[PDB]
Amino acid sequence: SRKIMVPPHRMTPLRNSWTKIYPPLVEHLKLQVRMNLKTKSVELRTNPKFTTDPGALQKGADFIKAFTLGFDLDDSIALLRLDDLYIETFEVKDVKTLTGDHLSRAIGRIAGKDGKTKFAIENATRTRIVLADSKIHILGGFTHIRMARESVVSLILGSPPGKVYGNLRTVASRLKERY
Amino acid sequence: FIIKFNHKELVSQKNEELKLQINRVKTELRSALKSTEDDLGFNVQGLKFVKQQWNLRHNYEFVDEYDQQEKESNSARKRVFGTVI
Amino acid sequence: KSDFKFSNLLGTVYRQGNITFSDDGKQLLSPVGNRVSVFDLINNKSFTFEYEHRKNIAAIDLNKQGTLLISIDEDGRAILVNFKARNVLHHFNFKEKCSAVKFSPDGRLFALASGRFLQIWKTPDVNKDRQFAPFVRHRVHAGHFQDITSLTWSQDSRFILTTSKDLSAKIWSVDSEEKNLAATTFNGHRDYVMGAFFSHDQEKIYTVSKDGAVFVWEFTKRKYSWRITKKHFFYANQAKVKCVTFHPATRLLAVGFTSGEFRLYDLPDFTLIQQLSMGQNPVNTVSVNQTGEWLAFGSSKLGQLLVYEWQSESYILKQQGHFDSTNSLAYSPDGSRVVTASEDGKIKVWDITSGFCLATFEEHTSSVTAVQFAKRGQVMFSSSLDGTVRAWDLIRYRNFRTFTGTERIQFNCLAVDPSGEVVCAGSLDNFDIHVWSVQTGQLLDALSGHEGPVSCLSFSQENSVLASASWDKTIRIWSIFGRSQQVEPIEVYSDVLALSMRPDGKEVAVSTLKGQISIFNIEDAKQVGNIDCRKDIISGRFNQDRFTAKNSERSKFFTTIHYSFDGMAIVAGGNNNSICLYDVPNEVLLKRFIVSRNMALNGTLEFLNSKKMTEAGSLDLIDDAGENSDLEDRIDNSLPGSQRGGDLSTRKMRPEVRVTSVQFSPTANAFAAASTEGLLIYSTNDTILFDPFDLDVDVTPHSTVEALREKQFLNALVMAFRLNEEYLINKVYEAIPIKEIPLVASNIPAIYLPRILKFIGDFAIESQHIEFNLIWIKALLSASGGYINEHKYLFSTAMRSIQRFIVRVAKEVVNTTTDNKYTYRFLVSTDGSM
Amino acid sequence: YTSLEQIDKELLTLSIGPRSKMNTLLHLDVIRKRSKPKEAPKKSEKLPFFLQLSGEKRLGFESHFTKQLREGSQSKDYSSLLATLINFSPAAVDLEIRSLNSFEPFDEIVWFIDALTQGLKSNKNFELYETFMSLLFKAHGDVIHANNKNQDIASALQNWEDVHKKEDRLDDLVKFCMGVAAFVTTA
Amino acid sequence: ILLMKRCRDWNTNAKTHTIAQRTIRCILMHHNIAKLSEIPGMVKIVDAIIPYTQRHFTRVDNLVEQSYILDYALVEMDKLF
Amino acid sequence: LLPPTDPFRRKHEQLLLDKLYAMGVLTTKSKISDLENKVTVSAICRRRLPVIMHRLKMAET
Amino acid sequence: ANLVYKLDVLSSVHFVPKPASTSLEIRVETPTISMEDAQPLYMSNASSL
């Protein structure tokens, strides 16, 4: 009985995959939903013959929110197999700073060498970071989201590059090793 | 070394003055040694901080772990010694 | 004093067979060539089982409750072990050769792959008493055409699948009614199938073969039954798979190639996660953790074991023992580190508590033949056949100097002055005792005067003179310090070897070739006692022998002697199958130890079996390498004269049993003997023995606790030493207050002082009470330190253990106390920022 | 006879467990760097990203330690916190200490320091509790040196030193005990 | 900074280390300290100093251990008398 | 095939000649052409134990 | 190299070694904790150099 409104940041990308991801979720979960592009929002509800999971409407809404927020179909496939996964859409002005020239320098600091720092922080800390100009939709495990959250508040607050690059090395070891 | 070697006579001779003199000299030598050991241990821990602060500030670190540990081995100190095979 | 028992087999971490984990990730069980070794990788403590198999261990499986252990010999001599009781429950004899043992995850019944049959037996209850016939077989399944080489239970407890030496692999239901559900035969592999596994669900079965083929079997249509969905190939051109394992929850294969590489695979996709390599050894055994993140990998021909977490690209332990090669031994002054020599040139600092080597030293090309310690264990020396004697550090792990001869002669033994100034070594070839300085690497002189090789040397710890054992039948005393330069010969009956000297430094223990052990006095050159030794020696008749074990003159002597540090006992070990522990002033042996029980070794038996000699040739001397199915072990590169060579494939025989270097532990009433089987450690640390001292009718354990009620503290503690029970001593020791400690310790009698110092040094090593134990150490040493100085050699084992305790575990707490305090002083009083 | 956990409250007893747990907590980085293989192992780089999470079988997202640390400041008790601090894995502890989420307000630094003041006052697990601020000064040593002289952080650190001021008794005990043990055994 | 270059020279031996360790502590206590936090550029040179001090820390702490022999001498004499 | 006045050669076969002399298989230090000609299995089997008995005359045959 | 090995293992490896040598080595200033096999324990803490 939920409704997810797709924004303009994934409009035609969802239009190309209008039936590419629709047939997979209908096969696995069978949620009653249609491409109601008149209001630019899709309402998903439990079907009368396939309501065997109360969380299937919640899990499909998270994958619909993943496609709306910009996560790819590989993450949406991981959103289907989300027995241990979590998504937190922490945007800007949570760790608030100046929205003018300092935010542009923070955007350069988050990207690094044209997205190299964001790709390194995503790969080493084992997370998918959908970093917009202001929104950061991080997807991963409970320790992975926490390590993603602690790393992004480190760079906005001020730390040297050798401190954080040393830090993403050793937090990569601490979650990969469990005993 | 004197008190270590002459220990049996120095302990088994009863004198209140010897009890007072060693009490003055053990408490003062320990306090003088602790004074010059507090300065040494402060300089060890204080300047290890100065090293590791620079090693995160000025040093541009590297994500690639096996390539970083190869680069540190090339950037470490090396010395040549004469050997016999 | 004489209740020694086997407690730890240091070294030889893995030899052959099936390594396994516990149900938890704590314990790692590895098949050593006699017995099961139980290490623990979380709580760093090792343990080797005291029971002995008859030959090499084939397979090992532990119950999922961690209570029953089954270790099965290569001829099927099954031995149950109550795992927590650490004793033997039953001795079964499976008639054929068994290859794989696996309990059900339920643990009620276990399956055995012996011969071409699968045997399913019900496990006996542990809490039931030791019955005569505890094993009851459920069924036997014979539906196979060659030997079964692998076994894998289900994630449930009702399906068992076996892969055989024949190309097929069959699933057998352990329930009679479910025979129609699982009876199909999977085949189609081109080569030796050596593993099949159920998936995480019961539906899929992945079968792995020798040729590199992985087959995925799925129950579907083209009714319909068990097609092949997809095949996968490793594409190893000449590397063949040796064994596999598969944790289903993490869907990880871990394959073992004979070239040395091992690969990790995710099964529905067949992607290579990580591929690493050990070396040139075949990966003989692969096992997985129950949680599926620890992988135990092991190779046989170098005897190494490698536990590697697959997730983080980093090992946990990469250890490597060496069979047959430990030429010499040297304890550390603290009784926690034992180093050893090797035929490879490796000098490996093993650890007592966990049976793994700390550091390795490979800078000797030739075989290292004698290893000794000097100057509080920080420096250490080693002699090799390379023509050099090399010093080492244990702080920076490097050589200081490589002393050499004038022409690089060989070396037999090494000795050092207790002060780190002079090193000396003896030779087979030149037979002059060369001496070097520690500081200047040049040799000072050649102390000569012997006919034939100087066998053993040792410096006196007090008088600082050296004694030379030589094949001249003469013991030479050299006073080389301070204008003396005098030579004193003490000639003996026969070819004397393996000298040793008391920590008092006034006696010389020697071992003649005639068998007898003589004891002299250094200052007064007369003989002050000999002990006969020829009768209590087990000289094992070899399989290539052509004489009885009675007149077998091969190993009826001793080639290793070391005194006790108390100066009261001598351990004699030799080429024989025996280790003897003689008492010095009482002339008689205490008890005799059998080092190993293995017909895999040569001299384990005085009486060989009469069903092995045919009308021509012994049956076990028949070269049976050609019947093997492979190529690399069929290749024989055995040289004719490879007696104690450089490898074991060159031997052409089986290795002979011998012990070659024994030293007492300086701390904890133990002695370690370097054996063919590795490094045996016999210890008395269990202390389950009723040893009294001047008992009486009234004194009881009830009188101990009652004396603690009425607070008669010294009457409680001293009369607790009357029973000398460790829990009785521990009861009174932890209950008395701090303020009554110095009054109690000042009036403890002189008889019980070696007992309390032995107790405090033993107990405080693993005990959380640093502050309480060091209060007792302060009060004892400051109220009775004169007596310990007056009798140093009575207390030298206990006094070393106490200063071991303050250095090894109590000093680095003080180091972290000082380091935290100094960095707090800097961070709170100095500069700010910006 | 099972040993007591502590003889009396004025003793300084260690933690129940392996004695090398303090060794792994000091040198966690160097042990893994030795235990890494000599070369980088080969990988098929088409792996799933969340294969570790594919195990086949602000307030609400904060960790259980962080919630207990926040509740520890509310109830002024940290013995519930220190129980989980002991039992955590060394790799988990170094993850825990280096990520305390206390950069701008320095609150969880103050709560964790006040947690270890209560830990040293209880006098159990003293070997572990000393290594925990050794890891604190390794991780956020630059952080508290930057904001030194602040009256809240310096109050928490000086309250730890007044607890730590009576921890030189084992230092005086050790420096006495082996000096006698060296002198008696070598005479 | 030039004093710190001369301070490294005095720390090399084992007689003048008391002056060398006091001068470094003078930099971090007796001087203007927050100014000395500000200035970079010498930090390579200061890193070559420290393992000489750890030798002199371990030697001095061993001399503290040899100073407790008098504590044994005073206690045993008091116990005997 | 190496040049005759090669310093790597100049060290090498004299090291091998002393190895075989200490082995006992060849009993001449002068020639080096003996290391291809006089190196023989009969030269290497007379250094076995039972032949060396007969050279020391300790056995009858 | 393999002839010398095949000679010594034929010789009951009591063996007359090389005359002399003089070579050159290098030593990287690694921590001494990482100059051994993989292990949960160690004994050294200072630098190699």
From Swiss-Prot, chain A:
User: What highest taxon heads this organism's lineage?
Assistant: Eukaryota
Q: Name one GO molecular function term.
A: rRNA primary transcript binding
Q: Reply yes or no: does the keyword DNA-binding apply.
A: no
Could you provide one GO biological process annotation from this protein's UniProt record?
ribosome assembly
The chain's coiled-coil residues are: none
Where does it reside? Cytoplasm; Nucleus, Nucleolus
Q: Which UniProt keywords apply?
A: Cytoplasm, Nucleus, Phosphoprotein, Ribosome biogenesis, RNA-binding
Ranges where the KH domain occurs: 100-152
Q: Which residues form the signal peptide?
A: none
Q: Quick one: a GO cellular component term?
A: nucleolus
The entry's function note states:
Required for small ribosomal subunit (SSU) synthesis. Has a role in the processing of early nucleolar and late cytoplasmic pre-RNA species. Recruits DIM1 to nucleolar pre-RNAs. Indirectly required for cleavage at the A2 site of the 20S pre-rRNA, forming 18S rRNA, and at A1 and A2 sites of other pre-rRNAs.
Summarize subunit and interaction data from the UniProt record for this chain. Component of the small ribosomal subunit, ribosomal RNA processing complex (SSU RRP complex). Interacts with NOB1.
Family statement = Belongs to the PNO1 family.
What is the official name of this protein in its record? Pre-rRNA-processing protein PNO1
Q: Which organism is it from?
A: Saccharomyces cerevisiae (strain ATCC 204508 / S288c)
From Swiss-Prot, chain C:
PTM annotation (Phosphoserine): residues? 629, 642
Residue windows of the WD repeats: 11-51, 52-92, 93-131, 143-182, 188-222, 236-275, 278-318, 321-360, 363-402, 406-448, 449-488, 491-530, 553-592, 654-692
Under the heading InterPro entries, the entry gives: Apc4-like_WD40_dom, G-protein_beta_WD-40_rep, PWP2, Quinoprotein_ADH-like_sf, SSU_processome_Utp12, WD40/YVTN_repeat-like_dom_sf, WD40_repeat_CS, WD40_repeat_dom_sf
| Listed GO CC annotations | 90S preribosome; cytoplasm; nucleolus; nucleoplasm; Pwp2p-containing subcomplex of 90S preribosome; small-subunit processome
Q: Specify where the region named Disordered lies, as residue ranges.
A: 631-652
Identify the domain of life.
Eukaryota
Tell me where it resides: Nucleus, Nucleolus
Q: Which SMART domains does its entry note? A: WD40
Q: Which GO terms describe its molecular function?
A: mRNA binding
Q: Name one GO biological process term.
A: endonucleolytic cleavage in ITS1 to separate SSU-rRNA from 5.8S rRNA and LSU-rRNA from tricistronic rRNA transcript (SSU-rRNA, 5.8S rRNA, LSU-rRNA)
Keyword rRNA processing in annotation: yes
S-S bonds: none
**Keyword tags:** Nucleus, Phosphoprotein, Repeat, Ribonucleoprotein, Ribosome biogenesis, rRNA processing, WD repeat
The cross-references to CDD domains, in alphabetical order and at most eight, read:
WD40 (cd00200)
Q: What task does this protein carry out? A: Required for bud-site selection and cell separation. Also involved in nucleolar processing of pre-18S ribosomal RNA.
* Quaternary structure, from the entry: Interacts with snoRNA U3. Interacts with MPP10. Component of the ribosomal small subunit (SSU) processome composed of at least 40 protein subunits and snoRNA U3.
- Into which family does the record put it? Belongs to the WD repeat PWP2 family.
What is the additional note?
Answer: Present with 16700 molecules/cell in log phase SD medium.
Q: What is this protein called?
A: Periodic tryptophan protein 2
Swiss-Prot record, chain E:
Where is the protein localized? Nucleus, Nucleolus
Q: Which top-rank group of organisms is this from?
A: Eukaryota
How it assembles, according to the record, is: Interacts with snoRNA U3. Interacts with MPP10. Component of the ribosomal small subunit (SSU) processome composed of at least 40 protein subunits and snoRNA U3.
State the remark under miscellaneous: Present with 8070 molecules/cell in log phase SD medium.
Known function: Involved in nucleolar processing of pre-18S ribosomal RNA.
Return the protein name.
U3 small nucleolar RNA-associated protein 13
Q: Which gene encodes it?
A: UTP13
Q: Which residues of the full protein are shown?
A: 737 to 817 of 817
Swiss-Prot record, chain F:
Where found, per UniProt? Answer: Nucleus, Nucleolus
The main location class comes to nucleus
Q: Which terms are listed as keywords in the entry?
A: Nucleus, Ribonucleoprotein, Ribosome biogenesis, RNA-binding, rRNA processing, rRNA-binding
Q: Which GO terms describe its molecular function?
A: RNA folding chaperone; rRNA binding; snoRNA binding
Q: Tell me, what is an example of a GO biological process annotation in this record?
A: maturation of SSU-rRNA
Q: What's a single GO CC term here? A: nucleolus
Q: Which residues form a coiled coil?
A: none
The record describes the protein's role as:
Required for the early cleavages at sites A0, A1 and A2 during 18S ribosomal pre-RNA processing.
> What does the annotation say about its assembly with partners?
Component of a heterotrimeric complex containing IMP3, IMP4 and MPP10. Interacts with MPP10. Component of the ribosomal small subunit (SSU) processome composed of at least 40 protein subunits and snoRNA U3.
Name the family the entry cites. Answer: Belongs to the universal ribosomal protein uS4 family.
Q: Could you identify this protein by its name?
A: U3 small nucleolar ribonucleoprotein protein IMP3
Please give the organism.
Saccharomyces cerevisiae (strain ATCC 204508 / S288c)
The lineage is: Eukaryota, Fungi, Dikarya, Ascomycota, Saccharomycotina
The gene for this chain is IMP3
